[PDB]
């Protein structure tokens, strides 16, 4: 008699959805699939605008610090770099502020997260020759 | 040529016999093993590594003391090929060490902490691959 091979049979055909240990998955995917498109369309656009004006970019940041804190804590001489701007995007997923000390987002004190400029392992890996929907801005053309 | 040397470190009951007495039982025991060797094929030809140069082979070392009777235990094979029980390592060691040392012979009369420490050596060897050596005879590593 195969015992391990038949595991989970009882909770497959003789169990209710509301009377089982299985949790729903559609709820998480609802807010996850939508956020992927936001980072793709607004990703390159944000970086292009930041790099549009190479010089004189740090002047705006320096003046802003004189109004919030008054005294420039990060002040440095002309012979030292001020900072490096990193293209970040806002958070759209309504995550709950859990009390997990080992979490990566529970201790977030700002509404902006870094964006990877290059990725070698695409998350939406297709199972075949099919492409990803919404990744063809230019309309198609037929030989006619 | 070996009975006199083993007359010291042995139990009292198993020491009064002479050399000739042991030979009578040994002679008949070997014949039975060879005759019975003619689910027993998984531990006879699969584990033995032929060389063509070895004129003789050892006895009663790893796998020579089995197949004494016409039929052998069924569950015995499951504990050698499928998986060797490592949890009972300490239990077997204490049950074999007491045979040589009865606490009244040449050996000391105090032995209690040996079983506790011997168990640790078995677990440490498990990471190295001690479990693998149980299934496959220790012949490939030597050569």
């Amino acid at each position: 008699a195969f015992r391990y091979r038949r595991e989970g049979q009882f909770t497959k055909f003789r169990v209710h959805f509301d009377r089982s240990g299985f949790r729903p998955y559609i709820d998480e995917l609802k807010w996850e699939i939508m956020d992927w498109h936001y980072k793709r369309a607004m990703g390159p656009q944000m970086k292009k605008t930041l790099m549009s004006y190479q010089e004189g970019s740090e002047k705006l940041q320096y003046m802003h610090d004189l109004i919030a804190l008054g005294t420039a804590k990060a002040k440095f001489p002309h012979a030292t770099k001020r900072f490096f701007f990193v293209p970040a995007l806002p958070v759209t997923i309504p995550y709950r502020r859990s009390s997990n000390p080992f979490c990566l987002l529970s201790a977030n004190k700002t509404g902006w997260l870094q964006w990877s400029p290059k990725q070698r392992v695409p998350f939406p890996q297709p199972l075949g020759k099919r492409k990803v929907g919404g990744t063809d801005p230019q309309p198609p053309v037929f030989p006619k | 040529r070996n009975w006199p040397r083993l007359q010291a470190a042995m139990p009292e009951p198993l020491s009064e016999l002479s050399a000739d007495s042991v030979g009578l039982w040994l002679k008949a025991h070997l014949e039975r093993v060879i005759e019975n060797q003619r689910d027993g094929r998984g531990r006879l030809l699969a584990q033995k590594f032929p060389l063509k140069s070895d004129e003789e082979d050892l006895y009663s070392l790893a796998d020579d003391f089995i197949f004494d009777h016409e039929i052998v235990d069924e569950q015995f094979c499951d504990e050698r090929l499928s998986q060797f029980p490592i949890d009972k390592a300490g239990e077997l060691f204490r049950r074999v060490a007491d045979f040589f040392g009865l606490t009244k012979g040449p050996q000391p009369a105090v032995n209690d902490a040996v079983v506790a420490q011997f168990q640790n050596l078995v677990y440490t060897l498990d990471e190295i691959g001690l479990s693998n050596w149980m299934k496959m005879d220790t012949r490939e590593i030597e050569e």
Binding site: F2, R3, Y4, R5 | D78, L81, S82, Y123
Partner: protein, 95 residues
Amino acid sequence: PEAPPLVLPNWQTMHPVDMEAWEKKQRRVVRTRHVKAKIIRQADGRKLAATMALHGRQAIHRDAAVSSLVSVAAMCASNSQRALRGELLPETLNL
């Protein structure tokens, strides 16, 4: 006590997470549902004792020796074997 065996697992002898492939690496079925048969006590010699008790009843009205009659009383004065199943204890004692 009513629980001699105390089987507790450990870290070195724990089943792997992928238990489906474990069954495929065995010659025959080993693990099985919890099925253990208990031992049922038989008469434990009480069946033979009942037959022997009837013999002493017949050896009362024979006018035998006093020494031989002492054995009849000992059997009738039992407290853990004869019990009170049949209504013969008071009848034999009265006779």
